[PDB]
């Protein structure tokens, strides 16, 4: 069993040290991986201070006794990710153990308003006696947002499915919301609206049957 801190934060341009602690580390070296949301883990440290090709030299590794440390000198925005240490157990037949992970937050990144795009139901779905409204939200930072739907000028609240925010490749966030209606309901109102609020400011997009 290897222990890590669950959350560590660093400001842009400063140095951070992620620790990995375990009794097995007295016998075998520690490797490190970086993982960004929606991707596979990437090896950054074989062990000691040896890195694969392609890993910038701002990453460095060290170890002593029962602890190992990954050090990032001069953190940049692309270093925001999860980090796992990994080694070989010293007891028994030596299974392989992982650390719990460390979510590394980089401070000082720029804010951003959400970009909203609302699609009305397609003619093919209506002919199949169904109707979906698609509200696509992207490029907002920080990653907190609230979505509300409106039939004409009234809240609907029924048939709404909204995803949790996920981090894009540019460290900003995206989300989506779906409103499922019957073809009768879509044609018996004059408009529907998707209202997206972020950091106190709201963006409202409206569609209409035509």
């Amino acid at each position: 069993e290897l222990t890590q801190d669950p959350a560590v934060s660093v400001a842009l341009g400063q140095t951070v040290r992620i620790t990995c602690q375990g009794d097995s580390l007295r016998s075998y070296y520690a490797s490190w991986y970086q993982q960004k949301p929606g991707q596979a883990p990437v090896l950054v440290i074989y062990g000691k201070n040896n890195r694969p090709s392609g890993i910038p030299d701002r990453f460095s590794g060290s170890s002593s006794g029962n602890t190992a440390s990954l050090t990032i000198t001069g953190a940049q925005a692309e270093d925001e990710a999860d980090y796992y240490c990994n080694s070989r157990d010293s007891s028994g037949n030596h299974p392989v153990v992982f650390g719990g992970g460390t979510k590394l937050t980089v401070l000082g990144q720029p804010k951003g308003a959400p970009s909203v795009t609302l699609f009305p139901p397609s003619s093919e779905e209506l002919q199949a006696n169904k109707a979906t409204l698609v509200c696509l939200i992207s490029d907002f930072y920080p990653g907190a947002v609230t979505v509300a739907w409106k039939a004409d000028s009234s809240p609907v609240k029924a048939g709404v499915e909204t995803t949790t925010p996920s981090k894009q490749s540019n460290n900003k966030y995206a989300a989506s919301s779906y409103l499922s209606l019957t073809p009768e309901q879509w044609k018996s109102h004059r408009s529907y609206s998707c209202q997206v609020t972020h950091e106190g400011s709201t963006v409202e997009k409206t569609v209409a049957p035509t």
């Binding site: 016998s27 075998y28 070296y29 490797s31 991986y33 929606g38 596979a40 883990p41 090896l43 074989y46 062990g47 694969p52 796992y84 990994n86 080694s87 070989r88 028994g92 037949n93 030596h94 299974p95 392989v96 153990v97 992982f98 650390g99 719990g100 992970g101 970009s115 909203v116 795009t117 609302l118 699609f119 397609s122 093919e124 779905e125 979906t132 698609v134 696509l136 992207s138 499915e161 909204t162 995803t163 996920s166 995206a174 989300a175 989506s176 779906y178 997009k205």
Partner: protein, 231 residues
């Protein structure tokens, strides 16, 4: 050795047996390495499952020892994984990887006390569920230029009601990559997934260029090529 690729069922009913295979291409399985399996449950950490040598010797994770069997097929340059008595907690993304040799003694050269996994597969998603596989329904999202910059429009594809995960989307057989944004799926109250894929294109091309989204849903062996045209 240069590339590993997993392949499995995608869906497994509770108390069933998970069966996976990793094809090794570009190198031989008879190398002096430990061919390993790793998984990661949704929203959780990495977990080591086990490893096998090219002679057949294995080493398992003590918490999963009673349910796992790892094999090696030297006739097909492959190694496989079996996990029985599955439950909901076995839903995860499974990876195959390759580890270096090591020493358990105390008097080897220094390079025999490293451990890492430098060659990984792309991973495969296995969800343990008692429900049935459901293919997707693809509907076009007609172009709209109101939310984009000057001289651009947004058109997309709606992938509705599929199970289980995942689906992949591409545009014009991969020839269109700039401006593509595929959003993560939503888990509807019915237990079925849905997502959308949007691409930003010049608004001056909406009447002259053909736009087709290629939706692939491997768990159901389905592939749809939906044309997206203006209103």
């Amino acid at each position: 050795q240069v590339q590993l690729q997993e392949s499995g069922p995608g869906l497994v009913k509770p108390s069933g047996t998970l069966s996976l295979t990793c094809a090794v291409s570009g190198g031989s399985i008879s190398s002096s390495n430990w061919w390993s399996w790793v998984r990661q449950p949704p929203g959780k950490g990495l977990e080591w499952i086990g490893e096998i040598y090219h002679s057949g010797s294995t080493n398992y994770n003590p918490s999963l020892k009673s349910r796992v069997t790892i094999s090696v097929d030297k006739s097909k340059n492959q190694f496989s994984l079996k996990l029985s008595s599955v439950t909901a907690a076995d839903t995860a993304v499974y990876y195959c990887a390759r580890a270096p040799p090591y020493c358990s003694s105390t008097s080897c050269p220094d390079d025999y006390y490293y451990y890492y996994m430098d060659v990984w597969g792309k991973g495969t998603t296995v969800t343990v569920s008692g429900a049935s596989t459901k293919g997707p329904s693809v509907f076009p999202l007609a172009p709209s230029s109101k939310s984009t910059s000057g001289g651009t429009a947004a058109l997309g594809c709606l992938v509705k009601d599929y199970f289980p995960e995942p689906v992949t989307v591409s545009w014009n057989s991969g020839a269109l990559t700039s401006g593509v944004h595929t959003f993560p799926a939503v888990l509807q109250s019915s237990g079925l997934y849905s997502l959308s894929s949007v691409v930003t294109v010049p608004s001056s091309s909406l009447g002259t260029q053909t736009y087709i989204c290629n939706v692939n849903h491997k768990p159901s062996n389905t592939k749809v090529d939906k044309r997206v045209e203006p209103k």
